[PDB]
Nanobody
């Protein structure tokens, strides 16, 4: 089969504050050849871009509002796309899917993530 496969993981029920690092395994399709399309859509609400880079692999794109919160990157040696998540928020509760266009429409699915509210640690 001459078809690429996308692996989306990292999105799950996590606690508020701290930091999260999502990953995306590639299959049949080179990660150091094109950029990784990142997007997020809340339940009931419309979808909104989270990260977008160029196939060239020069620099990433992110609004001045989202900047310094979410960045897109990938490694050729490991062949995987990483997604840094800083300054987590409560509205983060949503799904994150990927998309790639290399000769044929190829898109993953979308990982759901949950951010609990303020609470006390566990002793």
């Amino acid at each position: 089969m001459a078809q690429v496969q996308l692996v989306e993981s990292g999105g799950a029920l996590v606690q508020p504050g701290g930091s999260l690092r999502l990953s995306c395994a590639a299959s049949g399709f080179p990660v150091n050849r094109y950029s990784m399309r990142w997007y997020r859509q809340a339940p009931g609400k419309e979808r909104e871009w989270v990260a977008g880079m160029s196939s060239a692999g020069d620099r990433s794109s992110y609004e001045d509002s989202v900047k310094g919160r979410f960045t897109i990157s990938r490694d050729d040696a490991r062949n995987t796309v990483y997604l840094q998540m800083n300054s987590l928020k409560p509205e983060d509760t949503a799904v994150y899917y990927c998309n790639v266009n290399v000769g044929f429409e190829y898109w993953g699915q979308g990982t759901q993530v949950t951010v609990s509210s303020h609470h006390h640690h566990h002793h």
